[PDB]
Amino acid sequence: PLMLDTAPNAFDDQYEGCVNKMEEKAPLLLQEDFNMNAKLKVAWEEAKKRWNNIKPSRSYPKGFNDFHGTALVAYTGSIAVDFNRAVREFKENPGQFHYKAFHYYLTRALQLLSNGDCHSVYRGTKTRFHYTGAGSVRFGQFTSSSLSKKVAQSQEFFSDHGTLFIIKTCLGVYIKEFSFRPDQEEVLIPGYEVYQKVRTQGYNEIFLDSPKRKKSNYNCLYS
């Protein structure tokens, strides 16, 4: 099983105070990520084509650019697994993290698209999660979820071997208009949101409540 805690070793940059500097530097950072991350480069090039098609259908927040849209599209893609891993195991060895620009653009995309809105979402997994009694929980890595418990419990994401999270989030963003699969009613949650109330029920249900934004362990690391 996997441990559920405050994600002490996860890269959790919120970029407080360095948004302007990052938008200027992230483009070169992205080329660097690409030069050492073939899978990301491929996933990005494909996400860009899809973004080009998505963009014309709606207006986006002031400042939301193609990097933001492409990063969000790519995340609902297959690159999500390796990216989440890289972020989760960051502190383990930060020297080989090749999502410097990607992480920034995805984080900023969610910040630009976020409002006050809180949601009741569900997340199903096939891997069992054990709450290690830290006192609160953060996912650390970005994590997808669905407004529909049915979607979350589908054989696509869930199994008896796994866990069903019942989450109240207030930083999560509804990104239906970015997902490769539009029936998922996906809500994307940043890894730095904290759940002050944690309750395990039975062998595979975990209720995460009292969401709150709190400072991250890392800030503007690559700025």
What's the CA gap between 83 and 5, in Å, rounded?
19
Sign of the Cα torsion 90, 94, 97, 103 reads positive
Torsion of CA 151, 155, 159, 165, to 10 degrees: -10
Domain map (residue ranges) of the chain? 1-223
**Residue located via tokens 């809105």:** 117
Using DSSP's 3-state secondary structure scheme, residue 206 falls into strand
Q: Which residues are annotated binding-site positions for NAD(+)?
A: 75, 123, 141, 179
Give the per-residue SS3 of 61-112. Answer: CCCCCHHHHHHHHHHCCCCHHHHHHHHHCCCCCHHHCCCHHHHHHHHHHHHH
The verdict on whether 186 is a catalytic residue reads: yes
The verdict on whether 156 is a catalytic residue reads: no
**Quick one: residue 54, left, alpha or beta (phi over 0 = left, psi -120 to 50 = alpha)?**
alpha
Select which of 108, 144, 145, 146 is catalytic: 144
Partnered with residue 188 across adjacent β-strands are 144, 173
CB atoms within 10 A of CB 49: 11
Select which of 88, 108, 123, 138 is catalytic: 123
In the chain, after which residues is the C-to-N distance over 2.5 Å, breaking the chain?
A: none
The verdict on whether 120 is a catalytic residue reads: no
Residue 108 phi, psi dihedral angles, 5° rounding: -65, -35
Structure solved via: X-ray
Q: How far is residue 141 from each of residues 4, 66, 82, measured CA to CA in Å?
A: 12, 22, 11
Q: Which residues are annotated binding-site positions?
A: 75, 123, 141, 179
CATH of 1-223, one of 1.10.1200.10, 3.90.176.10, 3.10.20.440, 3.40.1190.20: 3.90.176.10
Residue ranges of E strands in the chain? 2-4, 119-124, 129-131, 143-146, 164-169, 173-174, 186-189, 193-201, 205-213
What's the CA gap between 192 and 194, in Å, rounded?
6
Q: What is the resolution of this structure in A?
A: 2.1
